[PDB]
N, CA, C and O of each residue as an XYZ file, in Angstrom:
724
protein
N     102.315    106.760    103.831
C     103.666    105.461    104.092
C     104.853    105.637    104.660
O     105.253    106.790    104.819
N     105.574    104.631    105.037
C     106.517    104.542    106.387
C     107.495    105.924    105.280
O     107.572    106.083    104.061
N     107.897    106.432    106.081
C     109.495    107.509    105.469
C     108.602    108.244    104.569
O     109.327    108.972    103.891
N     107.478    108.388    104.267
C     106.756    109.117    102.829
C     107.038    108.251    101.609
O     106.761    108.801    100.543
N     107.557    106.943    101.530
C     107.227    105.989    100.554
C     106.222    106.682     99.619
O     105.267    107.396     99.927
N     106.669    106.296     98.376
C     105.330    107.199     97.411
C     105.859    106.599     95.801
O     105.517    107.098     94.729
N     106.997    105.113     96.028
C     107.274    104.865     94.704
C     107.692    103.655     94.809
O     108.381    103.307     95.768
N     107.185    102.478     93.421
C     107.628    100.844     93.552
C     108.497    100.953     92.155
O     108.197    101.179     90.983
N     109.629    100.701     92.808
C     110.736    100.383     91.639
C     110.390     99.083     91.054
O     110.566     98.128     91.811
N     109.980     98.847     89.992
C     109.762     97.526     89.470
C     110.743     97.435     87.806
O     110.328     98.053     86.826
N     111.665     96.825     87.764
C     112.421     96.561     86.255
C     112.511     95.375     86.528
O     113.166     94.918     87.465
N     111.532     94.437     85.335
C     111.668     92.929     85.291
C     111.485     92.551     86.181
O     112.241     91.620     86.457
N     110.496     92.890     87.210
C     110.157     92.562     88.623
C     109.609     91.450     88.445
O     109.659     90.764     89.465
N     109.025     90.890     87.459
C     107.975     89.884     86.431
C     109.094     88.593     86.734
O     108.374     87.624     86.978
N     110.505     88.173     86.822
C     111.290     87.391     86.524
C     111.258     87.197     87.926
O     111.409     86.009     88.211
N     111.076     88.141     89.160
C     111.588     88.080     90.583
C     110.620     87.724     91.498
O     110.838     87.739     92.710
N     109.518     87.390     90.984
C     108.413     87.259     91.734
C     108.388     88.542     92.630
O     108.485     88.423     93.852
N     108.281     89.544     92.144
C     108.657     91.128     93.043
C     106.832     91.196     93.355
O     105.895     91.331     92.568
N     106.876     91.026     94.949
C     105.516     91.481     95.438
C     105.887     92.585     96.541
O     106.974     92.730     97.100
N     104.573     93.413     96.734
C     105.214     94.720     97.377
C     103.470     95.162     97.997
O     102.320     94.859     97.679
N     104.329     96.290     99.338
C     102.885     96.620    100.052
C     103.146     98.038    100.445
O     103.837     98.166    101.456
N     102.788     98.997     99.928
C     103.374    100.563     99.774
C     103.543    101.068    101.022
O     104.553    101.551    101.534
N     102.064    100.851    101.615
C     101.774    101.254    102.854
C     101.942    100.797    104.443
O     101.456    101.288    105.461
N     102.831     99.652    104.246
C     103.747     98.765    105.188
C     104.661     99.341    104.877
O     105.133     99.829    105.904
N     105.379     99.665    103.837
C     106.606     99.561    103.207
C     107.658     98.736    103.416
O     108.806     98.895    103.829
N     106.435     96.997    102.704
C     107.235     96.210    102.318
C     107.275     95.302    101.521
O     106.143     94.970    101.168
N     108.386     94.513    100.885
C     108.428     93.797     99.938
C     108.954     92.433     99.689
O     109.531     92.052    100.708
N     108.996     91.313     98.505
C     109.374     90.353     98.851
C     109.837     89.961     97.123
O     109.170     90.282     96.140
N     111.185     89.173     97.106
C     111.238     88.877     95.707
C     112.060     87.464     95.854
O     112.699     87.145     96.856
N     111.945     86.822     94.880
C     112.534     85.429     94.907
C     112.707     85.129     93.394
O     111.835     85.354     92.554
N     113.973     84.576     93.131
C     114.205     84.504     91.832
C     115.315     83.582     91.534
O     116.148     83.350     92.410
N     115.392     83.056     90.411
C     116.654     82.067     89.870
C     116.379     82.116     88.539
O     115.400     81.656     87.950
N     117.874     83.059     87.855
C     117.599     83.404     86.213
C     118.937     84.078     86.005
O     119.831     84.070     86.851
N     118.997     84.530     85.087
C     120.207     85.213     83.914
C     119.463     86.318     83.162
O     119.749     86.666     82.017
N     118.370     86.896     83.991
C     118.291     88.086     83.604
C     118.187     89.548     84.505
O     117.677     89.357     85.609
N     118.461     90.548     84.314
C     118.925     91.657     85.424
C     117.445     91.892     85.455
O     116.620     91.865     84.542
N     117.281     92.204     87.142
C     116.041     92.839     87.384
C     116.522     93.870     88.724
O     117.545     93.748     89.397
N     115.559     94.795     88.853
C     115.614     96.094     90.284
C     114.346     96.045     90.532
O     113.598     96.070     89.556
N     114.040     96.001     91.236
C     112.930     95.919     92.556
C     113.026     96.676     93.588
O     114.149     96.950     94.009
N     111.690     97.260     94.320
C     112.068     97.746     95.505
C     110.883     98.841     95.591
O     109.953     99.057     94.813
N     111.228     99.428     96.756
C     110.201    100.852     97.332
C     110.983    101.801     97.425
O     112.179    101.607     97.205
N     110.493    103.098     97.782
C     111.372    104.478     98.163
C     110.229    105.462     97.314
O     109.001    105.374     97.324
N     110.956    106.254     96.711
C     110.606    107.712     96.646
C     110.734    107.982     95.232
O     111.622    107.439     94.575
N     109.853    108.834     94.690
C     110.057    109.196     93.669
C     111.112    110.620     93.178
O     111.880    110.842     92.243
N     110.698    111.277     94.233
C     112.186    111.978     94.233
C     113.347    111.812     94.896
O     112.952    112.120     96.021
N     114.579    111.532     95.040
C     115.599    111.435     95.883
C     116.133    112.767     96.618
O     116.114    113.931     96.217
N     116.526    112.321     97.600
C     116.982    113.332     98.827
C     118.300    112.777     99.448
O     118.581    111.588     99.294
N     119.160    113.670    100.189
C     120.048    113.230    101.239
C     119.136    112.559    102.111
O     119.094    113.087    103.223
N     118.418    111.601    101.972
C     117.904    111.090    103.376
C     118.221    109.834    104.032
O     119.154    109.214    103.521
N     117.499    109.166    105.339
C     118.164    108.702    106.001
C     117.033    107.487    105.587
O     115.821    107.500    105.804
N     117.872    106.405    104.897
C     116.783    105.106    105.075
C     117.301    104.210    105.654
O     118.467    103.816    105.678
N     116.098    103.766    106.299
C     116.173    102.551    107.340
C     115.759    101.453    106.045
O     115.329    101.773    104.937
N     116.088     99.805    106.663
C     115.578     99.173    106.512
C     115.961     98.060    107.001
O     117.089     98.096    107.492
N     115.204     96.677    107.061
C     115.250     95.769    107.263
C     115.317     94.442    106.974
O     114.355     94.100    107.663
N     115.617     93.663    106.601
C     115.638     92.286    105.566
C     115.977     91.313    105.638
O     117.065     91.256    106.211
N     115.591     90.385    105.328
C     116.033     88.648    104.932
C     116.861     88.694    103.866
O     116.963     89.914    103.737
N     117.342     88.351    103.246
C     118.735     88.462    101.917
C     119.300     87.216    101.578
O     120.451     87.037    101.977
N     118.777     86.336    100.952
C     119.800     85.354    100.711
C     119.956     85.246     99.303
O     119.002     85.054     98.549
N     121.463     85.397     98.823
C     121.890     85.341     97.653
C     123.090     84.630     97.211
O     123.401     84.470     96.030
N     123.896     84.118     98.458
C     124.465     83.249     98.514
C     124.430     82.649     96.698
O     123.410     82.410     96.052
N     125.765     82.536     96.254
C     125.628     82.010     94.729
C     125.144     82.615     93.622
O     125.196     82.104     92.503
N     124.723     83.569     93.842
C     124.013     85.031     93.606
C     125.081     86.132     92.801
O     126.126     86.551     93.299
N     124.606     86.457     91.569
C     125.241     87.920     91.265
C     123.760     89.151     91.352
O     123.022     89.686     90.524
N     123.862     89.159     92.396
C     122.864     90.239     93.172
C     123.369     91.171     94.377
O     124.223     90.892     95.219
N     122.646     92.311     94.248
C     123.231     93.272     95.317
C     121.743     93.429     96.343
O     120.625     93.070     95.974
N     121.964     93.854     97.258
C     120.821     94.827     98.239
C     121.833     95.996     98.457
O     123.036     95.980     98.718
N     120.627     97.381     98.194
C     121.233     98.226     97.881
C     120.082     99.349     97.726
O     118.987     99.058     97.245
N     120.434    100.789     98.212
C     120.147    102.158     97.843
C     120.431    102.207     96.799
O     121.596    101.996     96.461
N     119.382    102.527     95.845
C     119.603    102.654     94.188
C     118.582    104.043     94.227
O     117.662    104.462     94.930
N     119.458    104.540     92.837
C     118.593    105.833     92.172
C     119.467    106.207     90.987
O     120.410    105.569     90.519
N     118.889    107.534     90.542
C     119.581    108.128     89.898
C     119.431    109.714     90.121
O     118.644    110.251     90.901
N     120.672    110.567     88.979
C     120.268    111.679     89.017
C     120.561    112.123     87.332
O     121.375    111.719     86.501
N     119.660    112.971     87.305
C     119.471    113.660     86.165
C     120.740    114.183     85.216
O     120.973    113.689     84.113
N     121.515    115.246     85.804
C     122.409    116.011     85.106
C     123.294    116.387     86.251
O     123.057    117.157     87.182
N     124.724    115.446     85.901
C     125.070    114.895     84.882
C     124.288    113.756     85.171
O     123.791    113.646     86.292
N     124.082    112.733     84.141
C     123.499    111.342     84.399
C     124.106    110.713     84.814
O     125.216    110.505     84.324
N     123.634    110.036     86.038
C     124.238    108.866     86.614
C     122.935    108.109     87.602
O     121.781    108.389     87.925
N     123.736    107.207     87.791
C     123.033    105.675     88.177
C     124.124    105.275     89.385
O     125.253    104.815     89.214
N     123.474    105.577     90.630
C     124.427    104.814     91.680
C     123.510    103.925     92.893
O     122.304    104.004     93.127
N     124.647    102.988     93.612
C     124.361    102.162     94.620
C     124.638    102.858     95.375
O     125.206    103.932     95.175
N     124.161    102.225     96.854
C     125.028    101.975     97.615
C     124.746    100.540     98.356
O     123.753    100.439     99.076
N     125.553     99.533     98.187
C     125.525     98.340     98.752
C     125.615     97.923    100.043
O     126.579     98.426    100.620
N     124.862     97.077    100.801
C     124.625     96.869    101.758
C     125.137     95.433    102.380
O     125.559     95.141    103.499
N     124.895     94.562    101.034
C     124.857     93.380    101.292
C     125.034     92.835     99.714
O     124.372     93.476     98.897
N     125.656     91.988     99.306
C     125.979     91.436     97.727
C     126.084     89.625     97.748
O     126.238     88.965     98.777
N     125.964     89.086     96.418
C     125.921     87.962     96.351
C     127.728     87.545     96.105
O     128.489     87.688     97.062
N     128.183     87.109     94.940
C     129.145     86.484     94.476
C     130.173     87.889     93.705
O     131.389     87.700     93.726
N     129.665     89.215     93.069
C     130.039     90.065     92.690
C     130.223     91.093     93.160
O     129.409     92.009     93.277
N     131.692     91.050     93.596
C     132.137     92.786     94.026
C     131.829     93.773     92.409
O     132.237     93.401     91.309
N     131.254     94.690     92.594
C     130.967     95.830     91.901
C     132.109     96.443     91.656
O     132.382     96.587     90.464
N     133.117     96.985     92.712
C     134.061     97.693     92.816
C     135.646     97.059     91.872
O     136.658     97.626     91.462
N     135.194     95.756     91.846
C     136.480     94.651     91.516
C     137.109     95.596     89.913
O     138.237     96.063     89.753
N     136.186     95.623     89.139
C     136.741     95.912     87.742
C     136.380     97.355     87.749
O     136.482     97.717     86.577
N     136.009     98.356     88.484
C     135.748     99.595     88.092
C     136.844    100.722     88.728
O     137.591    100.184     89.545
N     137.073    102.001     88.553
C     137.762    103.111     88.997
C     137.543    103.195     90.357
O     136.513    103.692     90.812
N     138.767    102.579     91.303
C     138.873    102.908     92.669
C     138.706    104.700     93.120
O     139.677    105.423     92.895
N     137.887    105.092     93.524
C     137.619    106.797     94.435
C     137.814    106.797     95.908
O     137.419    107.732     96.605
N     138.612    105.429     96.535
C     139.093    105.283     98.207
C     138.153    104.742     98.797
O     137.686    103.691     98.357
N     137.682    105.308     99.874
C     137.048    104.814    100.887
C     136.345    105.901    101.597
O     136.938    106.973    101.717
N     134.820    105.725    102.220
C     134.555    106.392    103.200
C     133.755    105.732    104.469
O     133.409    104.553    104.389
N     133.558    106.254    105.262
C     132.938    105.782    106.391
C     131.573    106.386    106.802
O     131.488    107.614    106.778
N     130.520    105.674    107.166
C     129.412    105.276    107.059
C     128.641    104.719    107.820
O     128.721    103.494    107.727
N     127.744    105.161    108.718
C     126.364    104.429    109.487
C     127.508    102.492    110.026
O     127.264    101.370    109.583
N     128.323    102.782    110.766
C     129.056    101.576    111.329
C     130.130    101.368    110.381
O     131.020    100.729    110.941
N     130.420    101.640    109.182
C     131.448    100.294    108.245
C     131.968    101.539    107.112
O     131.341    102.479    106.624
N     133.391    101.088    106.941
C     134.102    101.414    105.924
C     133.257    101.252    104.463
O     132.539    100.265    104.300
N     133.357    102.039    103.665
C     132.716    101.548    102.004
C     134.064    101.584    101.110
O     134.989    102.388    101.223
N     133.974    100.768    100.410
C     134.592    100.910     99.350
C     133.885    101.811     97.739
O     132.969    101.486     96.984
N     134.645    102.780     97.742
C     133.860    103.620     97.030
C     134.804    103.908     95.376
O     135.955    104.246     95.096
N     133.519    103.540     94.559
C     134.635    103.164     92.992
C     133.566    103.628     91.993
O     132.442    103.968     92.361
N     134.044    103.625     90.468
C     132.687    104.971     89.645
C     133.278    104.009     88.356
O     134.238    103.251     88.488
N     132.488    104.197     87.048
C     132.752    103.956     85.730
C     131.699    104.267     84.659
O     130.494    104.370     84.888
N     132.233    104.391     83.578
C     131.027    104.897     82.748
C     130.620    103.742     81.813
O     131.267    102.858     81.251
N     129.488    104.025     81.845
C     128.424    103.685     80.522
C     128.204    104.195     79.545
O     127.591    105.262     79.527
N     128.777    103.396     78.067
C     128.706    104.378     77.080
C     127.169    104.233     76.240
O     127.016    103.199     75.590
N     126.691    104.665     76.245
C     125.473    104.418     75.124
C     124.956    103.133     75.660
O     125.148    102.158     74.933
N     124.239    102.901     76.968
C     123.672    101.405     77.460
C     122.065    102.397     77.826
O     121.720    103.567     77.988
N     121.441    100.950     77.808
C     120.185    101.233     78.398
C     120.107    101.784     80.022
O     120.729    101.222     80.923
N     119.271    102.935     80.226
C     119.248    103.785     80.874
C     117.945    104.009     81.233
O     117.064    103.346     80.687
N     117.528    105.278     82.507
C     116.389    105.931     82.411
C     115.944    106.716     81.070
O     114.742    106.973     81.007
N     116.729    107.116     80.023
C     116.128    107.838     78.953
C     116.381    107.329     77.981
O     116.661    107.849     76.900
N     116.273    105.720     78.400
C     116.149    104.933     76.923
C     117.131    104.513     76.749
O     117.138    103.433     77.338
N     118.751    104.793     75.928
C     119.735    104.489     75.626
C     120.849    106.016     75.676
O     120.624    106.963     74.921
N     122.255    106.024     76.879
C     122.433    106.970     76.640
C     124.281    107.027     77.609
O     124.926    106.013     77.878
N     124.519    107.808     77.785
C     125.986    107.666     78.345
C     125.913    108.217     79.788
O     125.808    109.432     79.956
N     125.959    107.441     80.738
C     126.038    107.826     82.247
C     127.193    107.227     83.197
O     127.776    106.168     82.964
N     127.365    107.824     83.987
C     128.477    106.850     85.196
C     127.771    106.783     86.211
O     126.943    107.586     86.639
N     128.205    105.509     86.726
C     127.849    104.578     87.822
C     128.797    105.295     89.320
O     129.866    105.902     89.254
N     128.235    105.074     90.207
C     128.552    105.739     91.523
C     128.721    104.684     92.549
O     127.642    104.721     93.141
N     129.580    103.591     93.211
C     128.992    102.574     93.706
C     129.603    103.244     95.151
O     130.498    104.090     95.145
N     129.049    102.789     96.219
C     129.428    102.964     97.794
C     129.375    101.071     98.152
O     128.298    100.587     98.501
N     130.335    100.379     98.046
C     130.187     98.892     98.667
C     130.474     98.979    100.105
O     131.569     99.390    100.490
N     129.552     98.615    100.919
C     129.868     98.064    102.269
C     130.596     96.836    102.749
O     130.280     95.660    102.568
N     131.973     97.490    103.609
C     132.873     96.228    103.533
C     132.382     95.036    104.765
O     132.603     93.825    104.799
N     131.751     95.789    105.582
C     131.132     94.914    106.676
C     129.542     94.539    106.061
O     128.752     95.415    106.411
N     129.140     93.866    105.548
C     128.112     93.519    105.187
C     127.046     93.616    106.147
O     127.339     93.470    107.334
N     125.579     93.890    105.744
C     124.301     93.531    106.505
C     123.199     93.467    106.189
O     122.853     93.767    105.046
N     122.497     93.129    106.956
C     121.084     92.664    106.180
C     119.645     93.811    107.278
O     118.435     93.612    107.386
N     120.490     94.885    107.857
C     119.269     95.721    108.429
C     120.231     97.218    109.472
O     121.084     96.943    110.316
N     119.807     98.725    109.122
C     120.255     99.625    109.768
C     119.966    100.855    108.807
O     119.055    100.921    107.982
N     120.688    101.574    109.013
C     120.017    103.035    108.531
C     121.612    103.424    107.307
O     122.812    103.308    107.553
N     121.007    103.821    106.217
C     121.871    104.610    105.769
C     121.839    105.812    105.632
O     120.658    106.142    105.521
N     122.501    106.669    105.577
C     122.876    108.305    105.870
C     123.571    108.333    104.608
O     124.769    108.212    104.353
N     122.393    108.550    103.746
C     122.698    108.662    102.039
C     123.623    110.176    101.788
O     124.552    110.297    100.989
N     123.194    111.028    102.509
C     124.149    112.384    102.367
C     125.443    111.911    102.488
O     126.278    112.161    101.619
N     125.735    111.170    103.596
C     127.339    110.940    103.726
C     127.986    110.352    102.611
O     129.161    110.592    102.332
N     127.190    109.520    101.908
C     127.353    109.252    100.044
C     127.771    110.389     99.347
O     128.911    110.766     99.076
N     126.172    111.109     98.980
C     126.513    111.969     98.178
C     127.493    112.856     98.366
O     127.905    113.435     97.361
N     128.051    113.151     99.576
C     128.382    114.371     99.798
C     130.277    114.151     99.653
O     131.114    115.037     99.826
N     130.569    112.472     99.233
C     131.772    112.125     98.846
C     131.501    111.834     97.587
O     132.315    112.560     97.017
N     130.812    111.169     96.593
C     130.639    111.562     95.719
C     130.602    112.881     94.877
O     131.346    113.028     93.907
N     129.876    113.655     95.206
C     129.878    115.335     94.859
C     131.447    115.704     94.664
O     131.759    116.336     93.654
N     132.470    115.318     95.627
C     134.031    115.147     95.483
C     134.527    115.147     94.080
O     135.389    115.913     93.648
N     133.675    113.867     93.147
C     134.529    113.376     92.125
C     132.946    113.312     90.830
O     132.556    112.405     90.095
N     132.492    114.539     91.039
C     131.659    114.644     89.771
C     129.821    114.323     90.153
O     128.793    114.724     89.608
N     130.007    113.662     91.019
C     127.996    113.552     91.419
C     127.557    114.366     91.560
O     128.079    115.137     92.365
N     125.857    114.909     90.649
C     125.141    115.709     91.147
C     124.360    115.731     91.923
O     124.281    114.860     92.790
N     123.242    117.136     91.796
C     122.402    116.874     92.389
C     120.675    116.845     91.843
O     119.617    116.820     92.473
N     120.865    116.856     90.986
C     119.416    116.824     90.487
C     118.986    115.643     90.470
O     119.117    114.966     89.450
N     118.232    115.027     91.876
C     117.522    113.637     91.659
C     116.239    113.266     90.920
O     115.215    113.946     90.978
N     116.391    111.963     90.114
C     115.411    110.970     89.934
C     115.186    110.277     91.062
O     115.495    110.699     92.176
N     114.586    109.078     90.820
C     113.835    108.466     91.724
C     115.213    107.623     92.676
O     116.350    107.422     92.250
N     114.670    107.249     94.026
C     115.497    106.473     94.801
C     114.940    105.327     95.666
O     114.076    105.347     96.543
N     115.644    104.376     95.192
C     114.435    103.511     96.342
C     115.454    102.492     97.133
O     116.588    102.304     96.693
N     114.982    101.841     98.334
C     115.760    100.230     98.813
C     115.847     98.995     98.059
O     114.922     98.244     98.367
N     116.315     98.706     97.532
C     116.447     97.851     96.119
C     117.515     96.314     96.190
O     118.717     96.164     96.413
N     116.307     95.279     95.859
C     117.253     94.029     95.256
C     117.643     94.007     93.896
O     116.778     94.531     93.195
N     118.401     93.689     93.403
C     118.864     93.274     91.942
C     119.344     92.363     92.258
O     119.722     92.121     93.404
N     119.465     91.416     90.986
C     119.950     90.096     90.678
C     120.154     90.050     88.851
O     119.330     90.526     88.069
N     121.382     89.395     88.472
C     121.541     88.983     87.234
C     122.143     87.812     86.872
O     122.684     87.803     85.766
N     122.187     86.625     87.668
C     122.405     85.751     87.738
C     122.374     84.816     89.053
O     122.598     85.342     90.143
N     122.109     83.483     88.968
C     121.914     82.686     90.268
C     120.862     82.807     90.704
O     120.104     83.524     90.050
N     120.395     82.260     91.820
C     119.366     82.083     92.622
C     119.381     83.038     93.983
O     120.439     83.467     94.445
N     117.992     83.340     94.611
C     117.885     83.886     95.881
C     116.586     84.364     96.336
O     115.803     84.416     95.388
N     116.072     84.731     97.440
C     115.040     85.132     98.308
C     115.339     86.743     99.081
O     116.419     87.224     99.423
N     114.197     87.222     99.173
C     114.688     88.346    100.042
C     113.104     88.825    100.544
O     112.138     88.362     99.938
N     112.920     89.716    101.613
C     111.965     90.086    102.190
C     112.659     91.400    102.896
O     113.601     91.348    103.688
N     111.948     92.666    102.409
C     112.765     93.854    102.761
C     111.362     94.774    103.370
O     110.308     95.098    102.823
N     111.819     94.968    104.521
C     110.942     96.928    105.245
C     111.865     97.903    105.078
O     113.048     98.007    105.403
N     110.979     98.704    104.423
C     112.064    100.306    104.129
C     110.940    101.348    105.004
O     109.720    101.468    105.116
N     111.715    101.752    105.331
C     110.997    103.539    105.786
C     112.288    104.958    105.739
O     111.948    106.111    106.005
């Protein structure tokens, strides 16, 4: 599959009309609701790989991200590299970790703790790492290593779980069509 894609991310995809094609490295979704979902395509084992995407992403008025999304097992962490988003900047009420430069833009970097929250191990305590692109875009390449390298200076581990190019929303409405490699 494109870029060795071998994984379909499907959390609550049933509220997001989530449809995919692993062989083509494509997916679509469309939403209008107040339930959280995270859907997309990628790799069952994460790495500091370059992720190329091309999207149409329409999330005006929506609490939504277009993002590289994944987890690390130990210390347990959930991470996002946000390329475009809707109404809600996730670094607004988080702890600031400065900025970094990657793939043509500055990213705002931040972190927060989720205590005893739904996670990949059921219910657990984990750290979120966010890089939020200052100049939003819908196509390009994410040099994931740049983000990993920076977050690792602030406690981020390297035992990668899954890693995908994702669309998440939790409020409002939108549509997306994404190609990944």
